[model samples]
Target chain A: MAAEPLTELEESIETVVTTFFTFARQEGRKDSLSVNEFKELVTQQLPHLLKDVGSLDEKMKSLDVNQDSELKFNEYWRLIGELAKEIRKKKDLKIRKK
Target chain B: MAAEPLTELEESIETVVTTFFTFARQEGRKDSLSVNEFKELVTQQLPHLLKDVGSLDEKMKSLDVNQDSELKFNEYWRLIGELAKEIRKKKDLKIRKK
Candidate 1:
């Protein structure tokens, strides 16, 4: 089944997340994100998101566990899933209170 | 003398415009958006950005916008500015052309 309609805010977040794929596709990692594809993605797209995180290279090193310098969808998915979970906690208070 | 370096994308999209505000400051806004804050911000914050011209009331009416309806700083920002203006925005937002 198709996903239920996303919340207005939820929809907005999706656009932010989908961007990784859009560039991944446009930069010609049709099957996945290559090292160069990943670099271009960071240089071109994630300037703000990664700016404060100290050295994109270091961050990439952290994410690129395989050390191929490429970020597959799984790597991307893990980063986002973790961030999304963090966001949910901060947004919802009652849930936190309980 | 500050504001060292922002990219074309960075210098172009002000972080205030680009960075999402910490909604935790709002007592009534979102818990982070007082059901109403989330609603109004979505209505107003994203009017231009999220315009497929869907129903606005439905968007807010759905947000609890109260005890449960709050957003983290990240969520608030995500909904507003993003990595940068989409390249599409450049095409459609009335640029004079490079």
Candidate 2:
């Protein structure tokens, strides 16, 4: 996308956006993640971060603000926020002092 | 933090979260980004992704929803949201055939 390589942070953002669309486009609305896609994303893409979940359905509903059974980008962002907070908390304690 | 190697997506999330703390901890609040810190982050980390900014003050104001002249993690997340949307718009058109 550029003559220069993308920065790690920029690439990370791209990975997330691309991952969302890749799954969202599998079926149903091209702009949102269906229940199956949401489950697959959490199970596949976020396996290391989000765990101890028996039913993704409840999780999906919790994130599905519009209750359309489809998780929009904002809804997915919410899930990401949750995961980011948890990871940040863990790293907060473990970060080596400068 | 994990016995297994962190997955790509999970690591990406970590990169963002860690980046925020690394910069935010430079001055003032340890949990939020000051205006200077935000500008430095944009210039160094998002150079390829965010461009054409003469003064970061206006951009900072737009993102500083609390009107506190500082960006919290949630505020930083908002900035990420904007960049992600732009990048996805670009990729939406350039996606290669599966």
Cα-based lDDT for every prediction: 0.45, 0.73
Q: On residues B1-98, what C-alpha lDDT tens digit does candidate 1 reach at each position? A: 99567543333223333223333334554235444444555454453345533464444333333324455443344333332233123244354234
Q: What is the TM-score of each candidate against the true structure?
A: 0.39, 0.74
- Tell me what fraction of the real C-alpha contacts between chains A and B each candidate also makes: 0.00, 0.60
DockQ of 2: 0.39
Per-candidate interface DockQ score: 0.04, 0.39
**Using DockQ as the measure, which candidate wins?**
2
Candidate 2 lDDT tens digits, A35-69: 77877877677676756456777667777868777
Number of the top lDDT candidate: 2
Candidate 1: DockQ?
0.04
